[PDB]
């Protein structure tokens, strides 16, 4: 009754973070809406996702910049996100009134894999603070990070969207927005890709401010930098 | 009282599957046992894990062959594992008395990422059966695979060790051991790595049949093939 007969395919390339926490609700709304649209989703590295859209068979890249690198893709900012610190309750950090980055760097760290899903913002942060991060555990998944934090491997740094006190009781969470710069999740595709109505639809559903009018305009800019500044006077979604 | 004062480091490179399901209990037993041993664990692709041990800073590669590719690593078989089919209960497969591969290939598939964690055994299987797999979703993580299966993207093929009816109620599981050949998880390191007592200890704890005597012998074989046939007359662990 309220579905579309639109026929086609939607091939998306994304990371674990998006597919796990950002995507499922959207995809559910989409697949129900567009039954004759075959949906594909393939997890890979920022470099692999790039390839898949730049050279391969993917329609859309959904990743935190970079990327969707470069460059030679139309990039549209979707939302901002940052990190939380996860530890065990008898950890020293859990008992420190306000946690600085210096107090954090005294400890072994459990976090995302190199380059990354917001790791380079972490390393940049440590460099800027004249500090050396003791990285003990790297993984793509926030689920494994929690496990190893739970058994005492170290301090966990993950996306805040990957934290749930009802799904993760007993791990203490520490908001670290004033420790790390935020990350921007973006969406993109080749300039030659014909934008179907279900494509705009998916886009707007993932990023509301990305209406068909601003999407076509952004395409016409021929610059992902000018697309970014397009939204500098509004507040992007935060997750 | 029952711990060791042994000082050193254990740098391991593995996949999501091992770190999530095979590793945590072992690591927990290890870290408690060897407090002055700094433990590292880094998730990556079979090729990245190889590099890390062949050229990088990793001590041990823990991965399903390949690898731990090649070759130029000492490879020791740890255990055998196979796949299960996960679907929703009103799925046609869930209602088919005994599921063949042909009946499986009629459906969109949700599984591991290319090359892989037992995916090439899947593709080989389909090739052998003169069938074309409709791969819709690839991921490193069995957790995301379940989610997308749950919302109806397709049929899930995962490691059986990643299935738990108490942790995953309402997804029906289909044992597919007679559909796919099993996979062998292996462990390895450079010939030049000095084997510490905590290293043998970790090894034997991950693979009981890998005692210090069979480990040193395997090292002396100068062939990972001859190491494999060493255990052809015993039954390796199955998970």
Swiss-Prot record, chains A, B:
User: Per the record, GO CC terms?
Assistant: cytoplasm
Taxonomic superkingdom: Bacteria
- The protein's predominant localisation is cytoplasm
Q: Where in the cell is it found?
A: Cytoplasm
Q: Respond yes or no to whether keyword Cytoplasm is given for this record.
A: yes
> What keywords does the record list, in alphabetical order?
Activator, Amino-acid biosynthesis, Cysteine biosynthesis, Cytoplasm, DNA-binding, Transcription, Transcription regulation
> Is Nuclease there in the keyword field?
no
Gene Ontology terms, MF aspect: DNA-binding transcription factor activity; transcription cis-regulatory region binding
Q: Which GO terms describe its biological process?
A: cysteine biosynthetic process; regulation of DNA-templated transcription
As for what it does, the entry says: This protein is a positive regulator of gene expression for the cysteine regulon, a system of 10 or more loci involved in the biosynthesis of L-cysteine from inorganic sulfate. The inducer for CysB is N-acetylserine. CysB inhibits its own transcription.
What family does the database annotate? Belongs to the LysR transcriptional regulatory family.
Subunit structure as annotated in this protein's UniProt entry: Homotetramer.
Q: What is this protein called?
A: HTH-type transcriptional regulator CysB
Which species does this protein come from?
Salmonella typhimurium (strain LT2 / SGSC1412 / ATCC 700720)
Question: What lineage does UniProt assign to this protein's organism?
Answer: Bacteria, Pseudomonadati, Pseudomonadota, Gammaproteobacteria, Enterobacterales
């Amino acid at each position: 009754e309220h579905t579309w007969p639109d026929k086609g395919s939607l091939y998306i390339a994304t990371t674990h973070t998006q597919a796990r926490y950002a995507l499922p609700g959207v995809i559910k709304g989409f697949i129900e809406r567009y039954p004759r649209v075959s949906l594909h989703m393939h997890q890979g590295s920022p470099t692999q996702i790039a390839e898949a859209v730049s050279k391969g068979n993917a329609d859309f890249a959904i990743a935190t910049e970079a990327l969707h690198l470069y460059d030679d893709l139309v990039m549209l900012p979707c939302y901002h996100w940052n990190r939380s610190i996860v530890v065990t309750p008898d950890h020293p950090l859990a008992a420190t009134s306000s946690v600085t980055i210096e107090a954090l760097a005294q400890y072994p760290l459990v976090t995302y894999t190199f380059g990354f899903t917001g790791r380079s913002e972490l390393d940049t942060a440590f460099n800027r603070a004249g500090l050396t991060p003791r990285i003990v555990f790297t993984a793509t998944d926030a689920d494994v990070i929690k496990t190893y934090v739970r058994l005492g491997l170290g301090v966990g740094v993950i996306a805040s969207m990957a934290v749930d006190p009802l799904a993760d009781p007993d791990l203490v969470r520490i908001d670290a927005h004033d420790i790390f710069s935020h990350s921007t999740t973006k969406i993109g595709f080749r300039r030659s890709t014909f934008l179907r109505s279900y494509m705009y639809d998916f886009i707007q559903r993932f990023a509301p401010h990305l209406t068909r009018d601003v999407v076509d305009t952004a395409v016409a800019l021929r610059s992902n930098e000018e697309i970014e500044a397009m939204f500098q006077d509004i507040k992007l979604p935060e997750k």
